[PDB]
Amino acid sequence: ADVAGTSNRDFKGREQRLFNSEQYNYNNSLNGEVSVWVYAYYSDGSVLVINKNSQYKVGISETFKALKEYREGQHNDSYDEYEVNQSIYYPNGGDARKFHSNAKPRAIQIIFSPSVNVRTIKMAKGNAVSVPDEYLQRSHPWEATGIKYRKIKRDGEIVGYSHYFELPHEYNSISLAVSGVHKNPSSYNVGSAHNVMDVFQSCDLALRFCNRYWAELELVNHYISPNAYPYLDINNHSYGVALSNRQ
Amino acid sequence: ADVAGTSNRDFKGREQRLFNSEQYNYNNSLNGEVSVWVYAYYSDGSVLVINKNSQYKVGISETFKALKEYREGQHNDSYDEYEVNQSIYYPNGGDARKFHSNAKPRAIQIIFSPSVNVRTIKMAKGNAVSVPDEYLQRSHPWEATGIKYRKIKRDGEIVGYSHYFELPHEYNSISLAVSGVHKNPSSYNVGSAHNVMDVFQSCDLALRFCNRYWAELELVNHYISPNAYPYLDINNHSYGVALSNRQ
Amino acid sequence: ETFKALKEYREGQHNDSYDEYEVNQSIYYPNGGDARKFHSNAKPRAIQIIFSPSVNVRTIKM
Amino acid sequence: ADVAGTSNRDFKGREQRLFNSEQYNYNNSLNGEVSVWVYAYYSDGSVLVINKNSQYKVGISETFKALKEYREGQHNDSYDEYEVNQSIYYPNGGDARKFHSNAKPRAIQIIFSPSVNVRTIKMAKGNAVSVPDEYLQRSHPWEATGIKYRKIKRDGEIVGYSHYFELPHEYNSISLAVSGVHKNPSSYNVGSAHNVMDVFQSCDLALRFCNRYWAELELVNHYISPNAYPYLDINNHSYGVALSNRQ
Ligand SMILES: Nc1ccn([C@@H]2O[C@H](COP(=O)(O)OP(=O)(O)OP(=O)(O)O)[C@@H](O)[C@H]2O)c(=O)n1
Numbered sequence: 001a002d003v004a005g006t007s008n009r010d011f012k013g014r015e016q017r018l019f020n021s022e023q024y025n026y027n028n029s030l031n032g033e034v035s036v037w038v039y040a041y042y043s044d045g046s047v048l049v050i051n052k053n054s055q056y057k058v059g060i061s062e063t064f065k066a067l068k069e070y071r072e073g074q075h076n077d078s079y080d081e082y083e084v085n086q087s088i089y090y091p092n093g094g095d096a097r098k099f100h101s102n103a104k105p106r107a108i109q110i111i112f113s114p115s116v117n118v119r120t121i122k123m124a125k126g127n128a129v130s131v132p133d134e135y136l137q138r139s140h141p142w143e144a145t146g147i148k149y150r151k152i153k154r155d156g157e158i159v160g161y162s163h164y165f166e167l168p169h170e171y172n173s174i175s176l177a178v179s180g181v182h183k184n185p186s187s188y189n190v191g192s193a194h195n196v197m198d199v200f201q202s203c204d205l206a207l208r209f210c211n212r213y214w215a216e217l218e219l220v221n222h223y224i225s226p227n228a229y230p231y232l233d234i235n236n237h238s239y240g241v242a243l244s245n246r247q
Numbered sequence: 248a249d250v251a252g253t254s255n256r257d258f259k260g261r262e263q264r265l266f267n268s269e270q271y272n273y274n275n276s277l278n279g280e281v282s283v284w285v286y287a288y289y290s291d292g293s294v295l296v297i298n299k300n301s302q303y304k305v306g307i308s309e310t311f312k313a314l315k316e317y318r319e320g321q322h323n324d325s326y327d328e329y330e331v332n333q334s335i336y337y338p339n340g341g342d343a344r345k346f347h348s349n350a351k352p353r354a355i356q357i358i359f360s361p362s363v364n365v366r367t368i369k370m371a372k373g374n375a376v377s378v379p380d381e382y383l384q385r386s387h388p389w390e391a392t393g394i395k396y397r398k399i400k401r402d403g404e405i406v407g408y409s410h411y412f413e414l415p416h417e418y419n420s421i422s423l424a425v426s427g428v429h430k431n432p433s434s435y436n437v438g439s440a441h442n443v444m445d446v447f448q449s450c451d452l453a454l455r456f457c458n459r460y461w462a463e464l465e466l467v468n469h470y471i472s473p474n475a476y477p478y479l480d481i482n483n484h485s486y487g488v489a490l491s492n493r494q
Numbered sequence: 495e496t497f498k499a500l501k502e503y504r505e506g507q508h509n510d511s512y513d514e515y516e517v518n519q520s521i522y523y524p525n526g527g528d529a530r531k532f533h534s535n536a537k538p539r540a541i542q543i544i545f546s547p548s549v550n551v552r553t554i555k556m
Numbered sequence: 557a558d559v560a561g562t563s564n565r566d567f568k569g570r571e572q573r574l575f576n577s578e579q580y581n582y583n584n585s586l587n588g589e590v591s592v593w594v595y596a597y598y599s600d601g602s603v604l605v606i607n608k609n610s611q612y613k614v615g616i617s618e619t620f621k622a623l624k625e626y627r628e629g630q631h632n633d634s635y636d637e638y639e640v641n642q643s644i645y646y647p648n649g650g651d652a653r654k655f656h657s658n659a660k661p662r663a664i665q666i667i668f669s670p671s672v673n674v675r676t677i678k679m680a681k682g683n684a685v686s687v688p689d690e691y692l693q694r695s696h697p698w699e700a701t702g703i704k705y706r707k708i709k710r711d712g713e714i715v716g717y718s719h720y721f722e723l724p725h726e727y728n729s730i731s732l733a734v735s736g737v738h739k740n741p742s743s744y745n746v747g748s749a750h751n752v753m754d755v756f757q758s759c760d761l762a763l764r765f766c767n768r769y770w771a772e773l774e775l776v777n778h779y780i781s782p783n784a785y786p787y788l789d790i791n792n793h794s795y796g797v798a799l800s801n802r803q
Pocket residue numbers: 074075076077078079080081083095096097
């Protein structure tokens with residue numbers, strides 16, 4: 001045989017590069033996934049992640065309450081926290097024994113897979129009673145925030161898109177929904193009559209995941225990295241795996 | 248009058264047979280329901296059922312965590328089980344005090360109503376972090392598993408369709424979504440522009456049910472049978488009610 | 495060992511000890527108990543008996 | 557064939573009678589079991605049973621403490637009852653909050669299988685510190701109480717032997733061991749050198765059973781009767797199954 005790494009007859013090398021290329025390109029086809037993650041960061045350094053993976057389009061929608069830190073099989077001040085919610089829904093509406101609940105997120109990061117079209121991204125960041133803009137009568141039900149998403153990059157390739165926002169003030173009390181559509185550079189409308197029922201099925205088939213990790217380190221080691229998910233950490237460091245035309 | 252059971256002037260007999268026929272045929276019309284059930288079987292002999300009933304199309308989507316046994320108003324090892332999830336999401340990721348959680352399903356049965364079209368059935372059986380096929384980049388977001396569904400039969404009539412799979416190994420750790428479309432032998436697309444908004448409403452109108460029964464006996468007696476639902480038990484015995492052209 | 499002594503017991507953890515009393519009553523006599531479960535997971539799924547190589551195998555009794 | 561119940565050619569009738577005879581006679585052979593039961597009766601109407609089943613010889617030995625009522629998965633005054641034991645072991649030895657513990661047995665019944673030889677029965681009824689007769693220095697370690705055992709009879713056949721004694725006084729505080737030897741009308745000593753090691757194995761092979769039943773009714777219905785065990789109830793009524801030469 002020829003010698004490895006010296007000619008065009010290195011078939012294991014060419015198959016390696018094609019195997020990686022196919023993965024990148026499959027994800028971007030209309031058969032492939034589009035995924036979104038919402039990361040909510042707590043003052044105790046823990047991170048809630050919510051992930052949804054679906055064909056065609058994907059989204060997540062959470063209430064103010066659902067975004068608050070919840071520690072499984074531990075004490076949570078659950079009564080006092082009911083009271084905190086009443087005080088957040090309406091000023092002086094509750095009887096809590098605290099000024100600031102540490103269960104409230106300090107920051108959100110939204111990340112999309114590189115298969116999204118960034119121009120289709122929509123976000124409904126509501127107040128704590130789930131109203132996008134002060135009052136329903138004047139609310140557009142979303143904002144198109146694609147212009148704010150930063151490319152997460154590895155080796156010069158886009159592995160994901162990130163929008164990061166901090167909630168550092170007492171009045172930063174939110175409900176949150178985000179939505180993105182899978183890339184489609186063709187003129188075949190995946191929602192046209194021919195295929196619209198498959199999109200309806202995709203709503204049922206979307207797989208959800210959610211979990212609270214104790215630290216960003218643990219999130220990176222045991223969630224982001226093992227699954228080849230993209231990420232951007234608090235130090236602005238990029239994670240992901242570049243695959244297009246790469247061994 | 249003529250004597251019962253001796254002539255074509257037995258109108259109570261003919262109305263009986265028509266009443267049964269109408270029920271069978273209504274369910275199959277575009278006005279009728281399509282229903283799916285997911286049964287998760289636990290080592291303690293109990294069974295979780297999730298049912299969804301809707302027009303046009305129906306589906307269920309559950310996380311790994313949501314499928315685990317939960318005993319209402321009893322002790323559940325909830326802390327230790329948080330740790331079990333961490334160890335299932337990533338090898339050696341947790342600090343649980345057990346090798347195998349008995350809360351994990353030992354088997355799944357998916358059943359559809361006889362109003363589904365079997366060729367439209369789709370299933371997304373993911374790993375424990377809700378990824379259909381190892382990594383998102385190479386995942387088709389579903390499999391069309393209609394070929395595996397067995398007809399549940401009573402008196403020679405199809406009363407339902409069943410796909411049964413056991414999870415008997417330590418690595419059988421899953422998330423699960425299934426979807427089916429109501430039969431439509433016409434050329435009127437229920438998702439075409441004329442009616443697509445009614446399909447969007449059907450997503451909101453779908454009624455869900457879920458409950459943990461202590462035993463398969465209890466499931467058969469108090470869930471399957473009273474509601475005239477189809478079923479297939481561990482002994483391969485069929486339940487349901489045949490209605491087409493029957494008294 | 496008795497049937498009861500062979501059942502799983504987790505030291506310093508919860509064991510459903512009341513419900514498991516009821517399970518024993520149902521195992522001793524059909525429909526003899528009022529347990530909230532069909533199958534107790536405390537029941538052994540398998541037994542292995544091992545003797546040292548100093549036994550005479552022909553004397554083993556069970 | 558001949559007609560049932562009219563001749564000596566009723567083989568199902570003769571096999572029935574032999575099957576019953578064999579059971580009776582097997583039990584009495586040196587290959588058969590000998591069994592003892594200790595019933596301790598509590599003021600709340602519940603009954604503890606301890607059963608041992610073995611070849612050659614059988615016995616039970618319990619401490620004062622082990623004989624006291626214990627309610628599984630319920631409250632038992634366990635601290636106060638430690639104190640009660642201290643007061644029973646030595647007058648004014650404890651700091652209990654009660655004069656009489658209702659956990660103390662009110663009566664004992666000892667029953668042997670009909671395979672025992674009644675003349676071999678021995679009983680060590682000690683005081684609460686497990687001394688047969690006031691002080692060890694003057695204690696014979698047992699009494700031969702066979703003369704007190706009443707035959708439990710069904711249909712004129714001995715199905716068991718019973719010794720019943722009440723503990724109705726404050727000073728009736730006991731430890732208890734009983735022992736009986738399997739009948740052996742032959743001159744082959746089961747304990748002679750030829751077979752003595754089999755007797756040593758029988759000590760290891762003896763199967764034990766113990767359980768607290770809520771009532772004598774429950775004891776009769778769910779313990780005595782299903783297992784064809786002999787019994788004598790508080791009304792002096794006999795239970796058991798006669799088998800010798802019977803259909
Ligand atoms: N604003 C108030 C008023 C009263 N309590 C009382 O204090 C007790 C404990 O408070 P809770 O908030 O329920 O905390 P934990 O029980 O410690 O935590 P968890 O409920 O999550 O186990 C409760 O019985 C509750 O009735 C309270 O927590 N907060």
